[PDB]
Amino acid sequence: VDKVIGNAYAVVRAVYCNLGNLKLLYDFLNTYGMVLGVKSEAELKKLNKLAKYARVYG
Amino acid sequence: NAYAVVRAVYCNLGNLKLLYDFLNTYGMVLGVKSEAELKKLNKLAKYA
Amino acid sequence: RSNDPLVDKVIGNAYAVVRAVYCNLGNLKLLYDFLNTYGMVLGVKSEAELKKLNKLAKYARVYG
Amino acid sequence: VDKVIGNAYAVVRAVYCNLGNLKLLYDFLNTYGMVLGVKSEAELKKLNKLAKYARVYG
Amino acid sequence: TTRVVGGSGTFDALMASAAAHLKQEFKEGRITGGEYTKAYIAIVETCMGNATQYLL
Amino acid sequence: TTRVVGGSGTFDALMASAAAHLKQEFKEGRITGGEYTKAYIAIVETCMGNATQYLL
Amino acid sequence: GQRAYPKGMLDTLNRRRFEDGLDYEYNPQTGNPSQAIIEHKFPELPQSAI
Amino acid sequence: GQRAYPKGMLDTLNRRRFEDGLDYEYNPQTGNPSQAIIEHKFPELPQSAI
Amino acid sequence: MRKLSDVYKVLALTSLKSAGFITDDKVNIEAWGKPEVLAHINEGLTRLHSRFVLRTNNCIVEMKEGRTDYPLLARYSYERFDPAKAPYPYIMDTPQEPFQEDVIKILNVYDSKGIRRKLNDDHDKNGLFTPRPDVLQCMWPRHFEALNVLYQAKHPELTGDENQEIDLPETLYSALENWVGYRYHTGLNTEGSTAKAAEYLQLYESICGEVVDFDLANGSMSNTNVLFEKRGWV
Amino acid sequence: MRKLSDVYKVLALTSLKSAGFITDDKVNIEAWGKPEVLAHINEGLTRLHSRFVLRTNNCIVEMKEGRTDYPLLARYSYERFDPAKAPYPYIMDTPQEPFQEDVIKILNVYDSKGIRRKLNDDHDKNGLFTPRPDVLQCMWPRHFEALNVLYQAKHPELTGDENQEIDLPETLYSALENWVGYRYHTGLNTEGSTAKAAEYLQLYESICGEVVDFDLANGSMSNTNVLFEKRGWV
Amino acid sequence: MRKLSDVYKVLALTSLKSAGFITDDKVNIEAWGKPEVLAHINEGLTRLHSRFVLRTNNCIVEMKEGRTDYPLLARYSYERFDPAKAPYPYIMDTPQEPFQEDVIKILNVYDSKGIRRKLNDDHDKNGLFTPRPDVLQCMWPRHFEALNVLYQAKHPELTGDENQEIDLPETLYSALENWVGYRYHTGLNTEGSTAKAAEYLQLYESICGEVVDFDLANGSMSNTNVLFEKRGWV
């Protein structure tokens, strides 16, 4: 439906109201060390900044 | 929405041209293996 | 109440293709209906896809 | 008869309302491999992009 | 003067060298056609005077 | 004059040295293109007169 | 009722608009379409006759 | 009721504003939008006819 | 209706008399300045055919379904169809009188039924807008239609053939010469020639003013007041 | 609809006749001053297409969610999408008539539903402000929308190809020449050439005045008074 | 939206044609006068962006407690924070569109709540005075506030890069050239060049007058009379 407060502002507000849940997810990612799997070196280079441990499936 | 209908037709213009050409190019080989049903083919059916 | 200028703006020169299709909806429907009767030979790559055919397959030609 | 919504717009709308049937026809052409007959090389060169198999009746 | 433009005299040589020194501008802009001709015409007095001085 | 700009005569040398002495300004501002050409054109009388004096 | 248009004020189709009721556009440099474009009327009866 | 706009006073869209009721902006150098932009009216009946 | 060959001669004796390219017999123009003079006559007629309504012509424009914008060029005509730049022809011209791409202003367009359609009327279905002077935008291409488009016209382009006949009133030839003289004398960039160009150009206006001060070009118009009976007014 | 090649020739015979770069056949312009002349024609058409309403064109602008400012440049179009300077394309043009970045003034914008939206109306929700001439600020990008933007247009940029066709009324070619002559003759900075530039520039106004004094560029406008019935007035 | 590289070329062919620094190909400007020309274009755009309302931009200004005077410079912005001359950043700009220090006149400022605050109103609490054109004096920095400041803007400063794009209407390029010509020709202090500078400067006004006599720069304004219903007047 066509929102009165603006179509994109509704999306922005919806994301805003869910920041707390996203804050919990970000915290759990940041504090608990994570090991992830990667196909190649290019994808490994393209990892996020909180990824401490990785595994390259050759 | 006139614009939606016109845009939906326009974005599929190439596929429409392909379908129309295939209808005009119609030359699919039909297997009969029998003269009776081969004689009972439609007027547009070439190649058998 | 005429939306023809929109067609001229968007599908102006290539309107012949749309008109040719429109004149042939009956022919296209007949072609599709005959196509569903599977009264033809179908090209297949390798024996593997030969099994992958409709219960109404009537001829097939395998390449390789 | 002379349409009020425009003569060409009526044709465009009529084609539009039948896109689903044309979608089924296009899908059947695309997925089921098709072999077609051709008279010469010029006509063979003038084949569509979904025609995988052909036959040149010399 | 040989009574012909671009001749084998001294008046012709001087009068066809001044024009060949002004056409270097006219063919590179910096003057319109009208200005070039006016300069060329107002040189005949100078060229004729200096041609006689050189010849004799 | 050799009937060509920048020739091997005396009129050409003087007339192609005055232009090479005014182009030092035109290429450094201080005069527009139009002013430079006007100065160059009004020198032909002087150069032709002084070339004959030098030659003879 | 004999309108007298000045020669040059109203161009072509700008006099056809005028003679049809539609709003027109006139050339300002020619004059004013209230003192030019004269609508001739009945003369004024002299007081002498009465 | 045949308005006669001078040719040059009201530019494009400044005459569309005028013919819609909205306030317009006119070029001063052309004239005055009270003596130009003539609103033609009925002529004055001569006293002679009456 | 004079010929371009005669115009060359009459130009060589009155306006371009001191011109360089005048041949030794004084009654013709040399073959090196003829492109120049021809490019001045063509502009001269265009200006004269623009101020005065000298050539009013109508060319019918058939309706092709799916096309609303109808440029009135010569590439879309029938006898001059250009398949490289036009998909289908829709103008109609006879072989003896082909379309000459000579539309300056479009004045009044009727229909195939006799119904007049207004021009540039925002609130007027049944109105043919012109988005650019030599175009036409019919918003409803009905079946079996056509449009007799009465338009102001210019003289057909003078290619250069010395047997092409020129359509100008005999009284306006003293103004075409005074415009060729202006264009020619103003390009020499000399003080003497420039001052003559102004005299020739101003004389062009003077003759073009005497032609409009005596109705020699059919500029004055009178029509029956058909509006009177329609608005009531018994 | 002449070609740039023909414009070069007609310029070489009337306006730039005494110019230096005129070739030996007098019917063409040398290959060293052509960039200069082409840069004068392009400016010449821009001025002529600015005063008169010569080319009125409309380009539809689809709505992309999250974007309110909608510059009408060519980098945002469909056929000329430039991924380096545009995130997504939102204008719509056909391959035969691509967007040419030729917006001078925006005049009237409709919608996908037929509702006219006012321009520059401070107190008017449903109004598209233009913060700069070639932009558009819709404050509510509703779903399934588009905007047919009727705007004043300039002639598409002349790249330099001698086969590009020029859209100018035939009666206004005597004013384009008088503006090329002005631009060319005014740069030489010589007393003789400068005095000729003023004459050519003033003649540009005189011809541009005769075109507007005879409605040869479609400047006069008449419309039906639809306001009358709305305000009451039975 | 042309580029500074193209502006150099178009300047070299029309206005600065007789200038000394014109290179041998005539289609560019030598590398010794480019700082001079660039310093003339920057002034040229500033004048053009001052008379006409060509670029209306708004930059929000967050409230920092204890600060009432809020200069709208670029040193106080977020993306261009200068710790040496600004204690804290309070303007807000995105990386793609940073603040360019381009405020000429401040026109209308709203709030974070939607309440319009008057400008320069002596008897008006809730009024933002501007003690100097590029400043702002809010007398009550309330909590959680901001100010969308609609202001007249100038073109962002042209550093000198030949790939920076110039935001000018296509119809006003014939006036930017006539102002660069004025600035350049008036500095030579020669009688011939000075007399040409006056002609180029006067032509700047003539073109800047034709742009305002045809509403090509969006100068005419019409608004709904909202005052009517407020003062009563049923």
Added chain:
Amino acid sequence: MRKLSDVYKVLALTSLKSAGFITDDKVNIEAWGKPEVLAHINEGLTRLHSRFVLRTNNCIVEMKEGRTDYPLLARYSYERFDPAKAPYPYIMDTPQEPFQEDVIKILNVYDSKGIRRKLNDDHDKNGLFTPRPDVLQCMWPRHFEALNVLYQAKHPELTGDENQEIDLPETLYSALENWVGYRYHTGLNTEGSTAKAAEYLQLYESICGEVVDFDLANGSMSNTNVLFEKRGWV
């Protein structure tokens, strides 16, 4: 907010282009005429800051018992106290913004209690007379008082440092250059230079007239009519 170093360069390219002291790189001014140019910029800003109200500043003046005449000089301030010429400091300025002796006209002075005191009112106890523009004569130095004196201000004096930033509107830089050119060219006493000085000075008025004809310096003023409710008039 440009710098004096940049002003030197922009002056060297537009106004003082033919000046002798222009260095070989053409983008700077030699170190022998810089005192001269700096003495012209300082006068230039003073004139510009005098006509227009460009810098409105207020400096509070504490009351010292026994002193009625309160000159608003910099020797009496706090951060610039000069014990040799001032007995005690009574103006108040912060180290970051010291008093710059930049009072042109005093406009409106309030008190420490909020009571506005009239200026130059013969019959008005509670009135601060100014016996000379940069002074103040309070006739009753009450206890615990101060005076926020809103005054027209000039640009702080340019000492000569090439890192001092100049507070001028970007639209008025084309008038500061035309005044430096006037002052410089009028001192040479040569016929050619004097005639150029008049042109530069007259252009100063023309630009200073366009700035006031478009409200680019905030000259127009509107205020709420608070007098209405006070005089009765229910």
